[PDB]
Each structure stands twice: as structure tokens, then as C-alpha cells.
């Protein structure tokens with residue numbers, strides 16, 4: 002959206018790939034400048050750690066993104 | 074048949090039109106050579122008799138068949154008279170269109186601007202603004218004149234232009250044409266000759282093709298001019314960018330002719346100037362015309378009519394009698410031929426005398442044709458003949474042959490290069506301008522450009538085709554193209570392209586038929602009756618046969634060509650390619666004069682508010698400009714201890730996108746040349762960002778300034 | 793005789809009362825002519841929005857069409873609105889009341905004010921929905 | 927405002943409207959417009975004028991310029 006000043010809410014988790022292709026077609030040079038990150042849930046799922054890391058690095062951070070955070 | 078009855082009426086109509094036309098021309102002649110309210114009505118009533126006669130005779134021609142007519146001789150005359158014209162419009166609509174045209178002409182003629190500091194003295198375009206746009210070397214004065222004329226006159230002329238295009242399109246559609254652009258291009262249309270046909274659409278393509286052969290030489294001229302202008306205005310022009318539009322020697326950039334003092338290849342030595350030599354010879358109007366007549370008759374063309382020599386207006390009356398000194402040619406008819414122009418003692422007077430004599434000789438060479446057939450092949454031949462005559466009459470060997478310019482004088486190439494570049498700055502610097510303006514008008518009439526993207530497309534085409542960038546961003550409140558004479562006053566502009574190509578085609582053909590050996594630009598025509606005969610062949614044709622045929626009668630080619638023009642400047646082209654060996658030949662359509670002090674803004678309404686988020690219209694842009702003006706006012710009051718009245722008109726916005734993103738900069742209240750540096754605008758936004766944010770219900774992440782990041786977040790909860 | 797309170801424009805004026813110390817208490821900004829400029833721009837925005845979204849007309853009101861009188865240290869004053877290029881055209885109060893009602897959430901947020909702090913005498917706030925136990 | 931090309935000066939045009947016009951709108955336009963243009967131009971010059979004239983009168987054994 003920033004790279005091609007597209008209207009916010011037009012690109013979505015579903016039409017992202019097609020919009021990406023259209024934008025590259027419209028301006029390959031500008032698109033070439035754009036840098037994207039690989040989005041794979043398996044990657045974050047594989048981030049599962051054993052030992053204190055699972056609680057102090059994985060459970061403590063999931064709790065901060067939860068309402069009534071301190072209680073939990 | 075019918076064809077018989079058609080020619081019957083046409084022959085009668087020819088007699089009925091010729092006599093009354095002569096009376097009208099005689100009356101107009103008298104008034105133009107006698108500014109007396111009394112004769113003003115005299116020519117008027119005659120012109121009125123000429124106009125009513127017109128309408129009635131067309132009504133008479135209506136019943137006469139068109140396609141049924143086979144004899145193209147008569148068919149052409151009928152088609153010329155068959156034009157229903159604007160009358161196709163409703164009465165109320167006709168009155169509305171007439172008042173719109175009058176209003177636009179009056180706004181252009183009587184509009185005026187004046188200084189922000191002394192608003193008592195106001196300058197009109199004709200004298201004050203034009204002089205600034207030609208003589209001044211000051212960036213601030215030129216920017217003020219350019220922007221102020223655009224603001225006042227274009228903002229007045231925009232809605233009239235919208236109504237004008239709607240009404241003219243309606244009339245053209247009701248008159249069995251596609252659009253108004255089609256009506257204008259219908260002048261070139263030729264049909265029913267089976268081999269010399271020329272469709273109205275085809276012309277567009279041809280024009281485009283021709284421009285493909287100009288881009289190269291012109292880009293080199295542009296690059297050369299850019300380097301010179303960079304010296305005339307250091308720290309204002311990017312060597313890889315377009316030329317600012319207010320530095321091109323006049324108001325619009327139609328001609329670069331006023332850059333010569335600053336773009337002279339060899340300023341060391343001046344060009345040929347015999348005005349003094351003419352004064353030493355004490356040559357007078359009669360002489361200039363007589364020596365001119367010698368050159369014109371020197372090639373077997375008829376001698377100038379004695380009538381002209383008896384009833385002409387060569388010298389300024391200056392005897393309680395006042396006449397417009399503008400050079401012209403009157404073809405009253407039945408052997409009555411005249412030329413009216415004030416005669417000084419100058420080279421330009423000599424060349425204008427040759428130009429007008431070429432005009433009148435062309436006009437009188439085909440007096441045998443009917444009254445409706447007594448015109449040029451199209452809108453480019455008439456001026457092309459005069460242009461080639463003047464060009465042939467200005468050769469240095471011609472000056473050597475008329476008694477001055479003593480033979481013990483050698484002409485070097487440096488002065489020749491100077492002359493070639495002076496010619497280039499007028500001839501080649503206008504072709505992109507003409508092409509782009511006619512392209513924009515054609516696409517505006519065609520409906521290709523919506524009514525909310527006229528200025529966007531205007532400036533996009535101007536950056537892309539001409540390589541000229543606006544110094545201040547213009548929104549759709551403006552009508553910059555309507556600020557020209559030809560646009561507001563409803564005049565066609567493609568004549569200046571075809572005329573420029575036809576003149577050079579004719580010059581090359583005739584000067585080749587004159588058995589030259591040297592370069593084209595140094596060649597002459599005199600003593601070449603063969604060249605004169607070829608020209609005369611098309612001259613006498615008038616509009617009796619197709620223009621494509623008439624052009625072939627001289628150049629041997631049915632269509633227009635850029636090659637002859639490119640050859641006329643091969644010398645300068647080589648020199649320019651050498652001079653631009655280091656210089657970046659070309660331009661980039663992203664650099665703007667104001668782009669180095671702009672701030673970009675990105676707004677995310679759907680994130681901060683999610684649901685129940687307001688729509689973003691021009692009223693939100695008004696509020697945003699007011700907020701930025703408030704911010705700048707507060708910064709200047711609370712830090713610099715100065716009270717400055719910034720407004721929403723000082724906040725200039727460009728490049729608006731659906732992302733709700735755009736650029737802006739700020740100027741001083743009554744000074745478009747004063748731009749507040751970004752650093753001060755960043756400091757002002759830093760000071761007032763909380764108020765600017767809470768005015769829009771956004772909080773420092775849905776309203777970002779791309780250069781300004783928040784830093785004050787210090788927490789002290791757990792001590 | 794004559795009375796020195798009647799004005800030709802006093803019928804179509806709206807009074808405004810602003811309480812900065814009540815709303816913000818500490819760290820409350822000072823009120824200068826730049827805040828008056830912002831207030832005139834906000835009222836012009838409000839009138840523009842009302843005329844665009846209801847009457848289907850586009851009118852270019854500015855801060856020069858919002859005429860202000862009787863400025864007091866109470867932060868009180870009277871204002872009226874005129875047509876852009878016509879000083880003889882005065883927008884009747886009813887239209888100005890409707891415009892302020894439409895854009896009051898925005899005008900208040902532009903001044904960190906809350907309807908109680910920013911009072912348009914003659915225009916009463918009527919948006920208070922109460923509900924806790926369904 | 928409808929036509930910016932025809933501009934009136936005080937003596938020839940504005941005075942005639944003020945002397946004869948019975949139109950409320952025309953008279954209000956003439957009155958306000960003359961006030962806006964000419965008075966907004968004439969204010970700061972009047973401030974500097976009063977300061978200088980007061981200084982000159984004070985330096986001439988007079989209290990103020992009114993004196």
C-alpha cells in the first residue's frame with residue numbers, strides 16, 4: 002500500500018498475491034525496491050521451544066497479548 | 074439536372090457574393106486604413122449584408138443535392154456552403170454560446186494582475202506581463218507574473234471553458250460530426266477522388282508519426298538550452314530535470330526566441346544587420362517593395378499589380394489619419410489588390426514586405442477560380458508560401474546581389490551556426506508545444522480526459538512531451554491552457570504544425586529544382602523560373618483540387634514529412650550533439666522545482682477508526698490546509714516573535730492518491746517566490762502535531778509525515 | 793432616541809462560550825488570534841460539509857466568511873456566516889445551527905473541548921444514550 | 927465579485943452608488959468593499975504617521991499633535 006499508494010482495505014490477506022502481481026506489472030522498478038517477508042504459520046508453529054524458553058520466552062509473551070494480562 | 078441547377082445557383086451566387094464581398098472588403102479596407110466611428114458602422118452594415126446573404130444562400134443550397142453531384146468542381150463549392158454551422162444549436166443555446174465566447178474573449182483582453190505590495194498599479198497581459206516574460210532575468214518577477222496570470226485569468230476562465238466544450242460538442246454532434254475535434258480536423262478531409270483520399274482520423278496518426286522524427290533534434294536543443302539556463306539561474310535547474318515553465322522567454326513557452334541573448338552559441342559577433350546599411354542607402358518603403366517585386370518577378374512570376382502601387386498603405390498615414398500598421402493583404406477582387414503595413418527602415422520590414430508580397434502574389438495567381446474556390450488548398454499553404462519567400466529572400470548572397478554587403482567579405486561558419494540556432498529556437502521550440510496543446514484539446518473534446526483530470530493530464534503531457542515542469546502545483550480550479558489567445562478565443566492550433574512542415578518541404582523541393590550544390594539553409598531561389606513554376610502550379614490550384622494533390626504538385630509527395638525540416642538543421646543538430654556530449658541528453662518527469670522542500674503525508678482512516686470512519690473529501694483537505702496554516706502561524710509567533718498571516722492558500726498540495734497520501738509545501742502569505750524551508754515546517758509540525766492529530770481523530774500512527782517521528786514517551790510508573 | 797445594542801447582523805449571530813480551565817485544568821493552551829483563525833476555519837469546514845452532504849451544492853466558504861464580534865476574556869464572542877463572494881448574503885441561523893450539529897464532534901475535537909466547555913448558546917447537545925443492565 | 931474586470935474608484939463610481947443607489951445590497955457592497963481594500967491598506971501607514979507626527983509635535987514644545 003505504501004509502495005503503490007493503493008487505497009487502504011483494497012489489498013487483503015486473500016487478494017494480496019494478485020495485487021502484488023498487478024503492482025509489479027504496473028511498476029516493476031518500484032516493485033523491485035519493495036521487500037516482502039515469507040508468511041508461513043508452520044514457521045511460527047515450529048518456533049515451539051523446550052525448557053524454560055517455552056514459558057519465559059513463549060508463555061510470558063503470549064500472556065501480554067491477552068486482556069486481564071497480569072491475572073493470567 | 075440537379076448538378077446543372079446546382080452550378081446554375083452557384084454561378085449566380087458567385088456574382089451575388091463577389092460584388093457584395095468586394096464592398097465589404099473595401100469598407101473594411103477603409104476602416105482599417107481610417108479609424109473613424111462613422112466608417113465603423115459603414116463596414117458593419119456591409120459585413121451584416123455579407124452575413125445575412127451567407128445564411129440565406131446556404132438555406133438556398135440546402136435543397137441542392139450533395140452525393141448526387143459528381144462534378145467535384147461544383148461539389149466542393151456546395152460542400153463549403155452546405156455547412157449548417159452552429160445554427161444547428163437551439164436559439165437560447167446559440168445565444169448562450171455567443172455570450173460565452175464574448176465573455177472569454179473579454180476576460181482574456183481586459184484581465185489584469187498587480188503587485189502584492191502596491192495594489193494600486195495593475196498590469197494587463199498584452200503590455201506589462203508580456204514585457205516581464207520577455208526582458209526580465211529575475212526568477213522572482215517571472216514566477217510572480219506566470220503564477221498570477223494563471224491564478225486570476227484561468228480561475229475566471231475555467232467554468233466558461235467547461236460550458237463552451239459541452240455546447241460546441243453538442244453542436245458538432247448535431248452537425249453530422251463525431252466531436253468538435255472531428256469538426257476541426259474536417260478541414261483536411263478529402264473524399265470521392267479515388268486515390269488521393271484522406272480521412273479525418275488518419276491526420277492524427279500522421280501528426281504523431283512526424284513528431285517521432287523531431288524528438289531527437291529537439292531533446293538536444295532542450296539539453297543545450299537547459300545547460301545555458303542553469304548558468305542564467307544557478308541552483309534553480311536540475312541538469313537531469315525538465316525546464317521550469319516561467320523561464321522560457323514568454324508567458325506560455327510557445328517560442329524560445331527570447332532565450333537567444335542567453336543561449337547565443339557565439340555571442341562574440343552579432344548576426345547580419347543591414348537596417349543601418351539600408352538607412353545609408355536611404356532605401357524607402359517603395360524601394361523595399363520594388364526590390365522585393367524584382368526578386369518575386371526575377372523568377373517569371375507576374376509583376377506586382379499597378380493598382381496596389383496606387384491604392385496601397387505602405388507608409389504610416391500620420392496625417393490626422395490613423396491605420397493599424399499590422400502587415401496584411403487585401404483581396405477585394407476584380408483586379409483590386411492591396412497590402413497595408415507601416416514601413417520603417419529595418420531588415421524585419423524588408424522580410425515582412427517579401428512575406429506580404431508572397432501572400433498577395435499567391436492570392437492573385439488564381440483569380441480565375443470561382444468566388445467559393447478563391448482560397449488556399451488548406452490552412453497551412455497560405456502562410457507557408459510567405460514563409461518560404463521570406464526565407465529565400467534573406468540569404469547573404471541575396472544581400473550581396475542587391476548592392477550592399479561588398480564582395481570583399483567572407484562569411485565564417487560561426488555566424489552561420491549562430492543564425493541556425495536563432496532559427497531553431499523559433500521553429501523547433503514550438504512544435505512540441507503545438508503538438509501537446511492540440512493533443513490535449515483533441516482528447517478533451519473526445520471525452521478521453523474526464524472533467525476532474527484536465528489539469529492533471531495537462532501537466533503530465535507537458536512534463537512528458539515538452540519537458541517543461543510547472544513551478545507550483547495546479548489543481549482543477551485552474552484552466553492554464555485557456556490562458557492562451559487561441560484557446561479562449563476559439564481558434565484552431567494545428568495550422569502551425571502543418572505550416573511548419575509544408576514550408577520546409579516546399580523550400581527543399583524548389584531549391585533542389587533550382588540546381589543548387591551547397592547546403593539547404595544557404596541556398597537561394599532567384600533566377601530559378603523552374604522553382605517559381607513548380608510553386609505557381611500549386612499556387613493557381615488554390616482549393617480547386619485536394620491539398621494532398623497540391624502538395625505533391627510541388628514536393629512530389631501526397632502527405633507531410635519532417636525530413637526536410639530535419640535537413641534544414643542537420644548542421645546545428647551535429648553541433649548540438651557535440652555540445653551535449655557531456656550533458657545528459659533527455660529529461661526526467663519526476664523532478665519538480667518545489668519537490669526538494671515538500672513533505673509527504675500518509676493517512677490511514679480504516680485503521681485508527683475502523684468502523685464509523687468518515688469519508689475523505691475536499692472539505693477534509695480544506696481543514697488539513699487550515700491546520701497546517703494554524704501550525705505555521707503558531708510557530709512563527711511563539712519562537713521567532715513575528716506575526717505572519719498564513720492561510721490555506723499558502724499550503725500547496727500535489728500528487729493526491731487514494732491511499733490518502735500527498736505532498737505539500739508552504740509559502741509566504743503574499744509571495745509565491747518565498748518558500749519556507751522544510752526544517753521550519755518540520756519544527757512547526759512537531760510543535761502543533763497533537764492539535765493537528767486530534768482535529769482529525771488520528772493519533773501519530775494513522776497520520777505520518779515521513780521524516781518526523783515521535784520521541785517523547787518517558788514512563789516512570791514503578792519507582 | 794436610539795439603543796446602542798441593536799446591530800443589523802445581531803439577529804443571525806450565534807454566541808460561543810469556551811472554558812479551557814474546566815476542560816483541561818493544568819497544561820491548558822493559551823488562547824490567541826491563531827486559535828480564532830482555527831475556529832473560523834472549523835466553522836467554514838462545518839458549513840462546507842453541511843452544504844455538500846444535504847443540499848447537494850458545493851460552496852467554498854472560507855475563514856473570511858465567518859465574521860466574529862464581541863470577543864471577551866471569558867472566551868465569549870458572537871459570529872455569523874456569509875456567502876463566499878457576497879457580503880449581503882447571510883446564512884440564516886437555522887442552517888448554521890444544523891451545520892454545527894452535524895460537525896460538532898469534529899469542531900470540539902479540534903479544540904480539546906467537550907460541548908460543555910465549547911457552548912454555542914441556542915444550540916443544545918441532545919446525544920446522551922444511557923444503558924448499563926440489559 | 928461576479929465581474930472582476932470592471933473596477934470602480936471612489937470619486938467616479940463608489941460615490942455615485944452611495945449618493946443615489948437605493949439598493950440595500952449595492953450600497954452594502956460599496957461601503958464594505960471600500961472599507962476592506964482601502965482601510966486595510968491605509969492602517970499601518972496611519973500607525974507610523976501618528977507615531978512620527980506625535981514625535982515631531984513633542985519635539986516642538988507641544989504636548990501632542992492634537993495640541
Ligand SMILES: *[C@@H]1O[C@H](CO)[C@@H](O[C@@H]2O[C@H](CO)[C@@H](O)[C@H](O)[C@H]2NC(C)=O)[C@H](O)[C@H]1NC(C)=O
Nearest residue numbers: 076080081084143144145146147148441442443
Ligand atoms: C465542373 O463544372 C465547371 C463549371 O462549369 C467546369 O468548368 C468548365 O470547364 C470547361 C472545359 O475546360 C470550360 O470550357 C468552362 O469554361 C469551365 N467553366 C467554368 C465556369 O470554369 C468543369 O469542367 C466541370 N467538371 C466536370 C468534370 O465536368
Ligand SMILES: *[C@@H]1O[C@H](CO)[C@@H](O[C@@H]2O[C@H](CO)[C@@H](O)[C@H](O)[C@H]2NC(C)=O)[C@H](O)[C@H]1NC(C)=O
Nearest residue numbers: 132134135136137156157158160161247248249
Ligand atoms: C442545416 O439546415 C438545413 C436546412 O434545413 C438542413 O438541410 C436538410 O438536410 C436533411 C438531411 O440531409 C434533408 O433531409 C433536408 O431535406 C434538408 N432540408 C433542406 C431545406 O434542404 C441541414 O441538414 C442542416 N444541417 C444540420 C447538420 O442540422
Ligand SMILES: *[C@@H]1O[C@H](CO)[C@@H](O[C@@H]2O[C@H](CO)[C@@H](O)[C@H](O)[C@H]2NC(C)=O)[C@H](O)[C@H]1NC(C)=O
Nearest residue numbers: 368371470471472473474475476597599600601
Ligand atoms: C538574377 O540574375 C540577374 C541577372 O544576371 C542578376 O542581376 C545582376 O546582379 C549582379 C549582382 O548584383 C549585378 O552585378 C548585375 O549588374 C545584375 N544585372 C542584371 C542584368 O540584373 C541578379 O542579381 C540575380 N539574382 C540574384 C539575387 O543574385
Ligand SMILES: *[C@@H]1O[C@H](CO)[C@@H](O[C@@H]2O[C@H](CO)[C@@H](O)[C@H](O)[C@H]2NC(C)=O)[C@H](O)[C@H]1NC(C)=O
Nearest residue numbers: 338339485486487488489490491644647648651
Ligand atoms: C568552423 O570550422 C572550423 C574548422 O573546422 C572549426 O574549428 C575547429 O574547432 C574545433 C572545436 O574547437 C577544433 O577541435 C578543431 O581543431 C578546429 N579546427 C580548426 C582547423 O581550427 C570551427 O569550430 C567551426 N565553427 C563552427 C561554428 O562549427
Ligand SMILES: *[C@@H]1O[C@H](CO)[C@@H](O[C@@H]2O[C@H](CO)[C@@H](O)[C@H](O)[C@H]2NC(C)=O)[C@H](O)[C@H]1NC(C)=O
Nearest residue numbers: 189190212213214217741743744745746747748
Ligand atoms: C519573495 O521571496 C523570495 C525568496 O525569499 C525573495 O527573493 C529574494 O529576494 C531578496 C531581496 O531582493 C534577495 O536578497 C534574495 O536573494 C532573493 N532570493 C530568492 C530565493 O529569490 C523575493 O524578493 C520575495 N518577494 C517579495 C515581494 O518580498
Ligand SMILES: *[C@@H]1O[C@H](CO)[C@@H](O[C@@H]2O[C@H](CO)[C@@H](O)[C@H](O)[C@H]2NC(C)=O)[C@H](O)[C@H]1NC(C)=O
Nearest residue numbers: 875877878879880881882927928950951952955
Ligand atoms: C447577495 O445576497 C443578497 C442577500 O440574499 C442578495 O440580495 C437579494 O437578491 C435576491 C436575488 O436577486 C433578491 O430577490 C432579493 O430581493 C435581494 N435582497 C436581499 C435579500 O438582500 C444579492 O442579490 C446577492 N448578490 C450576489 C452578488 O450574490
